[model samples]
Target: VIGGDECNINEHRSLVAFFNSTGFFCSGTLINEEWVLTAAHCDNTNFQMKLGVHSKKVLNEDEQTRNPKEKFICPNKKNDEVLDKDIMLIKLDSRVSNSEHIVPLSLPSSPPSVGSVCHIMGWGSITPIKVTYPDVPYCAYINLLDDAVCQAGYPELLTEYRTLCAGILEGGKDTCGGDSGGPLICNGQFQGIVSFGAHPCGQGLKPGVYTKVFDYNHWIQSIIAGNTTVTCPQ
Candidate 1:
């Protein structure tokens, strides 16, 4: 079993695990003790929530384990868009203990500034190079870009109010393929979800994108209020 050093590596223990029969692919964060926030697109098909986990793999021998406390489906708001809201919440089966290594992160009612600095963490590939599977969980950082700069990069992406852009324009260290649904934390608060990025890591003109957590505050509240039991059709 990987220690907290290589797994739930961040100082803030709000990270979440998205898993299914196949394996784990991405990460998320606990916004509320009962509510976890992640990328909606990560729920491509099957979706399960695992709380109080730090490692990507759950060892059979280890007594402390995390399983899907609850399940949720991404809702399609319109035709072919997958909503692009790119946000989802998972309700844990029960309330988890708020330990030094496992606690919920506060959500900012407002979005960060255009050039504010933010950090992102995930268990995904770091380089543009291809691999057979996702890499070991790790953490990275990216600064928010001005709206004009972000819009110029993906003029055709239809930047919705629910989305934000960050990372380097010249391909530096940024979240890649398997990093989806992870948390973009700032100032001990979760601000965004690792959503999408242009292929080939950080291309010259392409910056990584994320789902704005502030934008879906109301939706998240609703889901948590319903006890994470509300299910929506895909």
Candidate 2:
């Protein structure tokens, strides 16, 4: 996280999983006792998740790292794709009892306004690839930019539907590796899924992009309810 501050481990208890299978670890959130929300690009099933724990490097009591038993993944357009439906859902082998520090996050029925202030929470590295990963979860306050501005910035990539743009105009603040799949929270509402950001993390006016949860609201609910077919909202 560029220009981010340390978030107390108990802030976003919804974040329940972290990924390290790709040499870098990304973050994920728990939407239900059995389902975890994450990025589809994080296809690695070997992600590590520590519950009831704050520090990333510490293995204290009340914390246990585990892998996913099953995953509900969305398809990305291609490896050449910049951003598509990059969201994913993971099924834990067992239910996580809701405790003071172990709770699930709820998804928004709609997308938030472009200029609204949103937040990103994760245990991501402050730097891009230098392994200066934090010892605990960190958070940053970023603005949701207009889609047109996002399009103007990345014309080669698509920026509609499930894809939403966020970050600052300045180059100093943004999310990076290990921050992917983290929550972009807004006013007690879950808005976006941390997908991809510009190189060197935050640079220039280019903002970080995310997967809008509202576009797949029906899909998410149907699946969790045991529906097998893909259903789009009207």
Candidate 3:
């Protein structure tokens, strides 16, 4: 987290994490007891899912920590890919029951108007060098930048047109390493997933990119409604 603190990050218990030895490895949103929304490029081979967590160093019985029963990366995901529709979900072994500390985030019912501000939460490295990560989570408020402006910055890489770019226009605000698979919440609804961004995070003139959740609304609904299998790609 570049510009965030605990109270704001855990505001609605929407934040969750995949933890490794020192602390969180990546951040995401808990859509439900069994489902976590995240970035497609993220992978967790050695970690435990910690939901409703504020501090990576703390452990509590109230927080529903578990291992993933399965993970689902969008079929569109490329094993050799980095961005381009980078979205995914992780299924928990047990359904985390409702609680003040474990409330899940709601999926957006409509598109967020362009230029609106949204919040992003994660345990990513505060600096670009991949050093100085936080023990507690962090949050950042960002304004949505036009897709055109976004594409202009990433003409070749953002080929799929499935991303939503947002950040300060003058720069110096973004999510970096360890933030992949994090949630972008606007009006308490999930809007995007922390996908990719330029190196030297928070760099001016370069906005952060995310996976547009509304674009995949149907896919998410289908999986949650038990209409499709949450298969992992081979």
lDDT of 1 by residue, 166-217 (tens): 7865557577777788887765567888887766776766777788777666
* Cα lDDT, model 1, residue 170: 59
Ranking by TM-score: 3, 2, 1
Tell me model 3's lDDT, rounded to 2 decimals.
0.76
lDDT by residue (1-234, candidate 3, tens digit) is: 565555553374877787777667777788876888887666757778788776656655587788878777677556666775577777888888877778778788987878788887777887766677877667778888888777777766545557788888888778888888888877666888888887788877678888888878778878887866543222
Worst-scoring 10-residue span by lDDT in model 3: 225-234
TM-score of model 3 (CA atoms) = 0.89
Query: Which structure among the candidates has the greatest TM-score?
Result: 3
Per candidate, the number of residue pairs that clash is: 0, 2, 1
Candidate ranking under lDDT, highest first, comes to: 3, 2, 1
TM-score of each: 0.80, 0.89, 0.89
lDDT winner among the candidates?
3
Candidate 2: segments with Cα more than 4 A from true spot: 19-24, 75-82, 231-234
